[model samples]
Target chain A: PLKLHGSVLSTNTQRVLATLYEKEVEFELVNVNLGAGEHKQEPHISLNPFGQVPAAVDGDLKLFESRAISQYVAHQYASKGTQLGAAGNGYATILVWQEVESHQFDPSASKLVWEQVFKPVFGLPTDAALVAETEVTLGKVLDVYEARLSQSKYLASDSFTLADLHHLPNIQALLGTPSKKLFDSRPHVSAWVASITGRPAWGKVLALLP
Target chain B: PLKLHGSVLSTNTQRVLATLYEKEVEFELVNVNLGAGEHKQEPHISLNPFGQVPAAVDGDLKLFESRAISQYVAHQYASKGTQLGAAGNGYATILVWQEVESHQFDPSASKLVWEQVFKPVFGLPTDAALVAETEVTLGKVLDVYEARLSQSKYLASDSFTLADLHHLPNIQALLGTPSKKLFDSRPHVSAWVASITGRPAWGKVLALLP
Candidate 1:
């Protein structure tokens, strides 16, 4: 049995749940008490050096990072994890798209949000200049997102794959923050989020969210 | 044939170069000259919205981001790209490690070096406070590196797949600057660097550098 250890409140944690639900794969969920800071303790550190969670302990193969686990799930059981297509097959097309969304969201999009939003939220100094720059920059990104959503209803494929899964939790994390404005103001992006998060797998996550 | 557009001096560009070499693949290097504003121009932006270099152009299929390009190369030439055992069946694993490395090494590790080392060296204002914090953070991560390297020579896979290739250049980027001291302190990391950069493809890259 595979075990996931993290806070259910984490939007990233929900992403794994949603992916597993969509894949119809069964796994155990262990919520790390954020207040307790158990994740910051030795056990968590032992499993993952980064000490962040949504890591999967699959028998002997323990994996960290939410997206990495999701990718692993998709591959371990090609039928369950095959949101894009089979990995070894012609899914190279889908694979490329997944990488695009990863880069699009991470250090590029999400990092901007973190620098601008989370720092302030957590009582850290905010870089207003960067915040403003990122908004304009991310607004431009939304234009690309809107275009992609308009074209395929998802980020890449006609169906729900890791690409859509990648964006939902990310938007969830960013929403109501400085980055939230980007998600709310963009109609196509909102609808796309509405559609992707509305899936059955997403319900599994919503059920657990506080 | 694939054409990679980016600065030869860039860590990201070198990432793509390592991937191509490890795969025993051939790609024509199209220099973007980042200082010359080519990356911000029409053709580059047309390929990548962010306008960062290392855009992989193969006929009509284009990919931006060094990590993504490397993944694409591994998938396309599965067996041939197996220096680290990350192609074909290991794509997901390869991607997972790449993500972690990006989060861990590229932004976090690389940022600290940039702030503490590069900024001052480049005559920019060095944020001593951030540098102190990042130095502490990076020291902790080296513990993770020690464990992972003990488990395998490469970062993600049992062998020298794209995961190791991903970090090769980023560490190289850091090593080229004042952060070289930080890199030198860790034996395993230094060994990994020596292992990857010592390869013929990487050797060529080193030779190309002034």
Candidate 2:
């Protein structure tokens, strides 16, 4: 059996879990309770130097970087008749989505949620300006999303591939009242999120979320 | 005939040029000077909303994002003997490199160069401590690089693919007197950069840097 090490409370962790559920793969969840500082140990450090959550270990290999793990796992296991992606992988195109998430969306939406939802409650000072900046930037990206979704139902394709699935949780988790406004503000974006959220596979993972 | 729309001095531009040379693709170079805010004008932005350089227009298809452009061009144009990536487009492994570079190296390297090199040269605030933080972060990544190179000649493999070629401008432009010291201090990383820099293909791009 494969193993996932991260707290359930983590957004990154949820994205992988959701993608895994889509594949219907059995994975053992070994929760690294950040509350108890479990992730801040020599074990986790040796596994992932960044000490970030959602590290995956299987057989002999250990992998970090959530999207990479999701990608490698999805491509490795669910080769056909599922939403993972093509069995014949176009590595360069896969990278376009990775770059989008890493450079464009990750810096804006995910951290906005962290700043707005997690940081302040954890007694850390949230920069007001950063939140605004993230929102504005995300708003613009949603416009990109609107255009993409208008032409195609998913972010990167006509099909529900991992590229769209990879982005699902971060965009979903980031939705608060203010952020949700942005999602609902655009018809195409709103419709696209709904279409993705309504997917039978994603619903299974969403049900498990605490 | 293929064409590139970017400045020779820009890093992203250099990345494309390096890939072009590595694949030995002959193309026209159109310089849009970033220093004069030329990228912000009508033509470039009409093509790429972000107004960033390194836009690739092959026939009717237009793609931005430096990494995407480089990969696309290599795949579409690179002669078989000079093919830089996987055989006939199962290029999934390149995503692995893109993930490592964009997620780990790009943001970290960008910060380091911006603070240590760009800021001081541009008469902006050069925060030494922040820059030092970036240095320590980079050193840790280089340690990983040392281990990675111990296995493969390039990041992903022995063949000099787009992955290896894409690093040119940054290695030449950003890794300056002090930055070179950091790289030279590390045996493996210094060698990796040295080998890539010494490539005849890369030499052509370096020659055009003036």
Candidate 3:
């Protein structure tokens, strides 16, 4: 069985969980005690030198990074479940969009998620100026997304892949904040979000989230 | 021939160039006029929606993100060159270290690079406080790296892969700063650096830099 070392509340952990469900891959979730900093200790650091959550250990294959874990799951079981990856140019396209999500969407959107959602949960004050700056930057990014989605149903193409799935965590965080308008303001992006989040696989992951 | 749309001076662009040379693949370098702000506009933006340099185009395969581009090149040319990637557990290991580069090292190391190197080039002042904080963070990151390097000659294993290649640009920037000592202080890391950047392909890429 695959062992997933992560936390329930972590977006990255949740990211891998969603992929597991999507690929119909069963894995044991070993909750990392983040509040006590268990992840910063020995064995965990051995699995992941960076000491981050959602390191997937399957026999000899010990992997870190939620996205890479997801990719491994998707490919290792490519024959078993829904096709969350592609081939030829489609594969390249999905990769580029994933990079866009990483470099462009994740930075600004995750920042907003932190400033708006996570900070308050930790009883920290939200920086309004940072939030405003992030909103503008995120809006510009979504404008590009809106344009792309106008032509295709998903970020890469008509079929949903890990690229689209990767956005779910941050999007969910934004939905809990006033910046839900960031998705709603763009019609195609809003629809894209609905299609992805509405997946039954994602539904199961959400149900498991603390 | 593959067309690489980017600037010669961009680290990201140089990263892809190094990979192209490593793969022994031929490509045409399209100089995106960053001085005239051409990369941030159309055609370039169409190739890479994020408007970042080093977007690689092979017929219909348009790819952005230096790492992703390198990945595509490595996999496509896996049958050729120095076997810059791997399969099975080896592939998984490489991906994890790539993540370590992205999430752990790059953030702090790149900040130091920006503050120490790029600031003066852009006629912007470097923040001394940020540099100090980044140096400490980078030292901690490299400490983990030192630990890892002690075990394996290269990051993923004894072989040279994109994991080590990814460090070239940022390390070069740090070399220009006082923090070159960060690498030199660690014996294994310093040796690993020499092993990777010492490659003739990297030397060729360096030769093209402005």
Candidate 4:
């Protein structure tokens, strides 16, 4: 059995959950109460020295970084459900898309979510200028995605991989904001979003969302 | 043969170079002329829609993102030279360590490099406050690394992998500054640094450094 530590409110934690569901991995989501500062303290800090949410332990293996944990689970259970990616060129493509998701895609999307959603929720003022700038940045990235998705079914390839799955939480959060057009304005990108989020595994994920 | 487009001054470009040397693959590095913004223009932009340097072409495979490109070369030439990582559990550990390098380590190191090294060279004012803050932040991380390294020889294992190699450029740049102590103060991290960067492959990389 696998044990996970994180909060539902964290997009990263949800990221792991989505992968767990897709991979059909049996696991436990041990709560790390963010409000109480539990994660930054001892024990939790041992799981993730960076003091971030979403760490996983399976048997003797302990891992942090939501993407790494998900990648580990996908590989550990490759014969169980979905094969996130194949070896050689396929894995390389997946890693490329994964890098793009982290470096290019997530930064802008998370900035938008921070400005539009979390700031207001936390009683903080939103930075309009930052939002505008990030939208332009994200727009350029989605333009590339728009072109790439037209040629491939998923970001990495024809099949669903962690690269595609990594985008789910950010997309879900962004959907509730004005920047949804940054995604929906692109034809192929919009369709790709629908296809991946439409997965029954992700559907179950949504039902558990905060 | 691989054709790489980037500059010697770039850490990311050096990242791929180190991987190429380790894999014993023949390659050419074409300059992107970063000063003139050639990377952001045609031909280059077509290779990497993001317009980042270090876009690689191995015949028909066009890949950007330094880590991803290195991963491709490592996989494509896995049978030829040093196996960066094995499949299954080995690959999973590499992924975890790679994630740690990217997520936990690079951001702080790069920020300091930009503030300390590049700012003075480019006639920009150094942000001492940010530098101080970054040291504290990075110190906490290395403390954890010190503990981990006491157990494992390399980040992923007792072998040199991309996870350890990825730190070469930033670690190289940081070594010239007071931040060298961030590494040197930690016995395990310091030794690990010398061990990985001392390789003949990384030696060629440093010789080409701008």
> Highest lDDT among the candidates is held by which one?
4
Candidate 4, chain A: TM-score against the reference: 0.96
Among the numbered candidates, top TM-score falls to 3
Residue lDDT tens for model 1, B116-207: 54577568987878877776777677767877777777787667766777777757766766666666777877787788778787877777
CAPRI-style grade of the A/B interface in model 1? acceptable
Instruction: Report the Cα RMSD per candidate.
Output: 3.4, 3.5, 1.4, 1.9
DockQ for model 3? 0.68
TM-score against truth, every candidate: 0.87, 0.84, 0.97, 0.94
Q: Write the per-residue lDDT of candidate 1 for residues A1-210, one digit (tens) a residue.
A: 779888777666777777777777878988788768888887887766787876778777777778788877776776653354533433544665666666655554666657755576577887878777777866777887777677776665667667778666667666657677777788988888778767777777778765
What is the Å distance of residue A141 in model 3 from its true position? 1.1
Q: Weakest 10 consecutive residues, lDDT, candidate 4 chain A?
A: A81-90
Which candidate number would show the highest DockQ if scored against the true structure? 4
lDDT of 2 by residue, A1-210 (tens): 779888777878887787778777778998787987878787886565566787878776677767767776776676533755533334444545555666667778877888877887698987889888888988987776677678776655566777677777777776653678888989988987887778887777677766
Instruction: Give a tens-digit lDDT track for model 4, residues A1-210.
Output: 799999878888989999899899999889999989999998999898778898888888888899889888887788887778766567877888999998889888988988998888787998999999999999999999998998998998898998999999999899999998988889999999999889988887788765
lDDT of 1: 0.72
lDDT at residue A94 of model 1 (Cα atoms): 61
Which order, best to worst by DockQ? 4, 3, 1, 2
Which scores better on DockQ, 1 or 4? 4
Q: What lDDT tens digits, residue by residue, belong to model 4 across residues B1-210? A: 689999998888989999999999999988999879999999999888898988998886788899999888887888877778855577777888898888788889889999988889889988999999999988988988898899999988888888888888888889999899999989999998889878999899988965
Candidate order by TM-score, highest to lowest?
Answer: 3, 4, 1, 2
Winner of 1 and 3 under TM-score: 3
Question: Ten-residue segment with the worst summed lDDT in candidate 3 chain B?
Answer: B80-89
What is each candidate's DockQ, to 2 decimals?
0.49, 0.35, 0.68, 0.73
